[PDB]
Point group: C3
Chain length 145, copies 3
């Protein structure tokens, strides 16, 4: 669909792979060990710099297994990697558990998902068109069946 | 439009609905009652298995009302449901509040949003093209100026 | 490109800007001060109402800097702003730190990213096609 130029900047850097054929995302591998204390955050280096084809972004998303089993997630999920970013890809992991969480070298601790981007042009208006939803949000449709 | 084949695998399973005509997401209904303690996570079963038309993924997203009013969210938001996944759709709910949170059968506790997928091919390079953002990230553009 | 009609409903409201030329998102500016206590949430008003071109949604996403440095994030990230919503854009910020976090007027405390929407029609089936992933999820591919 699209091309990503990848520059490795760490000996342990891995080109990400789609772990199944129909996978949305490719898993991101830590290049260094990081210990994340209870109720804190750590910054995990992926040791890669990217140039996405124009018109695409990369989302950095939480992996479901680590969330369920260790209460670890990507704190800024979905992390926005901009088309024009040329720095190192890094992942902000939060440990919401009561236990230490250790990231080892090669551990897949997030997934990257490419999405097409769409630029907005804003037009100032005195009034908007009316809809049925209108100003309803934040639970306006209820919870209970 | 696109089509989703849905198989109900639990007696309390419900076909998800778009709650307003221009809603992005369709709401996902719990099939079991689950109590989620303060500062913990619970697994909510939706009792459905999906086959999305090829080319599409499902995102499992937090509902704003429950986040604001109960500090309940989908811990892996946006949860990645792969085109090729044929298992049961499940939601990891975190309770970040100090109060017990009870999910009742039929409760709409997350939403599914269909998105088109875009597969990357990686080309490894020695150097990338330069941009004005460059390696600036993690707050490089400031907060108040 | 696509068009968003924007109505300001607060004197401090700003038209959001893409902060770099290749930025996915436009930053959302608070119009009122909000104090968010440790392990709490606050609702931040952006003072704008939108009408997106049909076929598009707005995602309200966490900014990486504030998450890393202050453990502040958008609690419902990515927040779903529906095509048919005509109310004020608001941001649910959670403070997961042990320190007070103050939002000042003008502070860019989230970003908006436009995405195209795709409406599903459900067809109920007794059986689904088989795949290689099959029922594997929640760690089925490993961590190492
Ligand atoms: O970050 C957000 C998310 C939602 N909203 C508004 C606009 C959106 O169209 C509306 C509903 O969003 P959700 O469907 O994500 N939340 P929920 O299902 O609780 O509310 P509702 O019952 O109104 O659909 O709330 C915001 O202003 N900010
Ligand atoms: O998960 C992430 C998110 C961001 N980043 C990098 C790439 C992105 O282009 C850059 C800025 O992302 P955000 O705009 O989401 N963060 P923030 O607005 O704080 O930073 P900046 O001021 O540089 O835009 O940070 C990562 O490496 N990982
Ligand atoms: O919110 C979610 C996310 C995932 N899933 C299922 C479907 C998805 O295809 C599968 C794997 O999702 P992730 O890739 O996000 N999780 P992880 O990488 O831990 O599992 P796996 O190793 O199977 O890919 O889990 C859910 O049911 N709900
Ligand atoms: Mg996975
Ligand atoms: Mg809703
Ligand atoms: Mg930014």
């Amino acid at each position: 669909a699209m091309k990503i130029k990848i520059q490795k900047i760490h000996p342990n850097a891995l080109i990400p792979k789609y772990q199944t054929d129909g996978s949305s995302g490719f898993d991101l591998h830590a290049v260094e060990e990081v210990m994340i204390k209870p109720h804190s955050v750590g910054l995990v280096k992926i040791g890669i710099c990217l140039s996405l084809e124009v018109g695409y972004e990369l989302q950095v998303r939480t992996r479901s297994g680590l969330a369920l089993n260790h209460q670890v997630m990507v704190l800024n999920s979905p992390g926005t990697v901009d088309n024009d970013y040329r720095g190192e890809i890094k992942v902000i992991l939060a440990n919401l558990s009561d236990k230490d969480f250790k990231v080892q070298v090669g551990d897949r601790i997030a997934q990257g998902v490419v999405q097409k981007t769409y630029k907005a042009e804003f037009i100032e208006c005195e009034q908007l068109d009316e809809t049925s939803r209108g100003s309803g949000g934040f639970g306006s449709t209820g919870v209970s069946k």
